[PDB]
């Protein structure tokens, strides 16, 4: 069974081009990965979930791009156009079906192209296979997007009118509602952007799951949010602003939504059907290299998360997706932790924020042995909120369980 799946970081990358090149590998099963280039390289078939969160301290504007055939094919794109100094993570996120030789990768807009480069925090790119084409009513997959000037109506749903891709019809546009066909284990994520304040809720069968906002004036950003939810048929999914919700963003920063079955229910093996979103309630400030908890479980299948430690314990080895929405009112750097009873930095991701609201988010896809810890861990930048109508949320799943 082929496991394509990598994460990216960036540390001594080559000088020049549109083409951003994440240089240092830190997961590249099946090496489908090109650390020279930049560019992921199709082998197997299917669809694929891409994701980037890129540290800037001015503007930036970013787009995943691919190719087919060697003729290259555009995109949304994604900007934070903050431009005071201070770190800001830039985020955004397709599925993508893929043929074999196709190739994909971020490009940087040439007027709006500044990448931190230094060791005080990290900007990564990662991509894995969700389904192999070759089944497709027994999956579920979509990335929706926004295409309007105009914002959502204050308090209302979200629609998404426009179709990246959609072949199971599970989100839709008509209504802005997502409703499962197949029961088990999805994941949702969003990037929107936004040129003043911004909440989205997540509801679920008519109640609201997480709730992620972001403040600004003028300038552009990118509010992210995402939750793993076990679903039974029938049930709908939605996203909905509250009173702050502005969706205007500059030209090229684009709003999408995906989301797509992991774990279907009564299919092959649930000791494998590995995946956990928690959240974190408690507002005690955090100290340095303290484990941060995230007290409340939405989902834990497989009970390998313990919210009483803020830990994960891979009890199935594997490749594992790991992903973060923290919202903020100040400065925030968390380290993302791998390893057994010592464990060792993998990146940190740092977002800055001065006298406003935030919601900033990293991910990354890490091959763990039967033992290894993973969690996140504090810094002297500590600025983190949990409470309803601003959540932190720390997820993860297994991939290919079967
Ligand atoms: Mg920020």
Redesign the pocket.
């Given at each position: 069974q082929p496991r394509p799946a990598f994460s990216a970081i960036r540390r001594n990358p080559p000088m020049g081009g549109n083409v951003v090149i994440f240089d240092t590998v830190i997961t590249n099963q099946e090496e489908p990965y090109q650390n020279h280039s930049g560019r992921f390289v199709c082998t197997v078939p299917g669809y694929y979930y891409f994701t980037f969160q890129v540290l800037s301290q001015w503007e930036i504007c970013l787009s995943i791009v691919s190719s087919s055939r060697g003729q290259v094919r555009r995109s949304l794109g994604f900007c934070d156009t903050?431009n005071k100094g201070?770190?800001?993570?830039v985020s955004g996120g397709m599925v993508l079906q893929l043929q074999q030789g196709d190739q994909v990768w971020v490009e940087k807009d040439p007027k709006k192209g500044h990448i931190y480069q230094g060791s005080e925090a990290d900007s990564v790119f990662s991509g894995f296979l969700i389904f192999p084409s070759a089944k497709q009513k027994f999956q579920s997959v979509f990335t929706v997007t926004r295409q309007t000037h105009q914002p959502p109506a204050p308090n209302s749903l979200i629609r998404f009118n426009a179709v990246l891709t959609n072949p199971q019809g599970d989100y839709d546009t008509s209504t802005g509602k997502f409703t499962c066909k197949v029961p088990g284990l999805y994941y949702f994520v969003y990037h929107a952007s936004h040129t003043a304040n911004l909440c989205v809720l997540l509801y679920r069968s008519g109640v609201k799951v997480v709730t992620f906002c972001g403040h600004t004036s003028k300038t552009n950003?990118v509010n992210s949010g995402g939750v793993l939810l076990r679903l039974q048929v029938g049930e709908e999914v939605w996203l909905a602003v509250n009173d702050y919700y502005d969706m205007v963003g500059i030209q090229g920063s684009d709003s999408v939504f995906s989301g797509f079955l992991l774990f279907p229910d009564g299919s092959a093996k649930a000791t494998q059907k590995i995946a956990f979103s928690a959240t974190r309630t408690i507002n005690v400030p955090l100290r340095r290299d303290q484990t941060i908890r995230f007290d409340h479980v939405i989902t834990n299948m497989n009970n390998n998360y313990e919210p009483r430690s803020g830990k994960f314990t891979c009890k199935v080895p594997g490749l594992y997706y790991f992903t973060y929405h923290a919202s903020?009112r100040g400065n925030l750097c968390v380290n993302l932790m791998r390893g057994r009873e010592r464990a060792q930095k993998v990146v940190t991701f740092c977002?800055?924020?001065y006298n406003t609201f935030?919601v900033?988010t990293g991910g990354m896809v890490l091959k763990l042995e039967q033992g290894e810890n993973v969690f996140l861990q504090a810094t002297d930048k500590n600025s983190l909120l949990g409470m309803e109508g601003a959540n932190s949320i720390f997820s993860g799943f297994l991939l290919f369980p079967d």
């Amino acid at each position: 069974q082929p496991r394509p799946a990598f994460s990216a970081i960036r540390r001594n990358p080559p000088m020049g081009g549109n083409v951003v090149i994440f240089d240092t590998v830190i997961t590249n099963q099946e090496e489908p990965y090109q650390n020279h280039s930049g560019r992921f390289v199709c082998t197997v078939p299917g669809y694929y979930y891409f994701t980037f969160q890129v540290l800037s301290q001015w503007e930036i504007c970013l787009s995943i791009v691919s190719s087919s055939r060697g003729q290259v094919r555009r995109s949304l794109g994604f900007c934070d156009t903050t431009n005071k100094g201070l770190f800001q993570v830039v985020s955004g996120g397709m599925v993508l079906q893929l043929q074999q030789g196709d190739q994909v990768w971020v490009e940087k807009d040439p007027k709006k192209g500044h990448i931190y480069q230094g060791s005080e925090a990290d900007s990564v790119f990662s991509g894995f296979l969700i389904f192999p084409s070759a089944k497709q009513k027994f999956q579920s997959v979509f990335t929706v997007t926004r295409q309007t000037h105009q914002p959502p109506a204050p308090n209302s749903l979200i629609r998404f009118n426009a179709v990246l891709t959609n072949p199971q019809g599970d989100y839709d546009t008509s209504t802005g509602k997502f409703t499962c066909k197949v029961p088990g284990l999805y994941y949702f994520v969003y990037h929107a952007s936004h040129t003043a304040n911004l909440c989205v809720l997540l509801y679920r069968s008519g109640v609201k799951v997480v709730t992620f906002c972001g403040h600004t004036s003028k300038t552009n950003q990118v509010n992210s949010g995402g939750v793993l939810l076990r679903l039974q048929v029938g049930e709908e999914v939605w996203l909905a602003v509250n009173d702050y919700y502005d969706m205007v963003g500059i030209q090229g920063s684009d709003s999408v939504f995906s989301g797509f079955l992991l774990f279907p229910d009564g299919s092959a093996k649930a000791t494998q059907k590995i995946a956990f979103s928690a959240t974190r309630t408690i507002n005690v400030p955090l100290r340095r290299d303290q484990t941060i908890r995230f007290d409340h479980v939405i989902t834990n299948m497989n009970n390998n998360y313990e919210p009483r430690s803020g830990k994960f314990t891979c009890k199935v080895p594997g490749l594992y997706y790991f992903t973060y929405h923290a919202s903020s009112r100040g400065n925030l750097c968390v380290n993302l932790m791998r390893g057994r009873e010592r464990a060792q930095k993998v990146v940190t991701f740092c977002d800055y924020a001065y006298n406003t609201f935030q919601v900033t988010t990293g991910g990354m896809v890490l091959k763990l042995e039967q033992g290894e810890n993973v969690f996140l861990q504090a810094t002297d930048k500590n600025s983190l909120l949990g409470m309803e109508g601003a959540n932190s949320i720390f997820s993860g799943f297994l991939l290919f369980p079967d």
